[PDB]
């Protein structure tokens, strides 16, 4: 299984713009599920307080990118993606917030990408409520940890 931990720095600033009702949208670097493996990346939003549904939620989405090994891998990507926002409080057992999502072959999002970054992504509009960040040490040293673990 490939595992990638996205360190999102400067996070205090990002929460501040969300409060000021400024759209916040971030993309991870690309990363490989393996070598050879798929190249994926992540989209995280901070939803405005004035949104209809999902107000004040964190959104989280996985996208396929064009990769070195694309021509060698089976398409569409089929498998499991586990998206976790990690707890950095000092307290076993730590309480991570995670959702496990199933890659179904019927989706367009995991078809072979032809553009550098496929705009069709797959994930959760309502991944985690912001008011859950104020209730655990999810942010430490002004940094948020988003873990992506891919199973095939």
């Amino acid at each position: 299984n490939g595992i990638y931990i996205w360190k999102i720095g400067n996070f205090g600033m990002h929460l501040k713009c969300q409060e000021e009702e400024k759209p916040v949208v971030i993309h991870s670097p690309g990363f490989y599920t393996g070598k050879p493996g798929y190249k994926l990346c992540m989209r995280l939003h901070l939803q405005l307080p004035t949104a209809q549904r999902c107000a004040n939620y964190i959104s989280l989405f996985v996208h396929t990118m064009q990769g070195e090994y694309d021509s060698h891998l089976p398409w569409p990507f089929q498998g499991t993606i586990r998206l976790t926002i990690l707890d950095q409080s000092e307290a076993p057992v730590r309480q991570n917030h995670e959702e496990i999502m199933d890659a179904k072959p019927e989706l367009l999002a995991f078809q072979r990408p032809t553009i550098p970054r496929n705009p069709k992504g797959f994930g959760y509009v309502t991944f985690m409520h912001l008011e859950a960040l104020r209730q655990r040490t999810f942010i430490k040293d002004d940094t948020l940890l988003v873990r992506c673990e891919v199973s095939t």
């Binding site: 989405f61 199933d102 367009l108 705009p119 069709k120 992504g121 797959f122 959760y124 309502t126």
Partner: peptide, 9 residues
């Protein structure tokens, strides 16, 4: 809460 495809922008 379940997953969904989602295009941007």
């Amino acid at each position: 809460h379940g997953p969904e495809e989602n295009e941007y922008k």
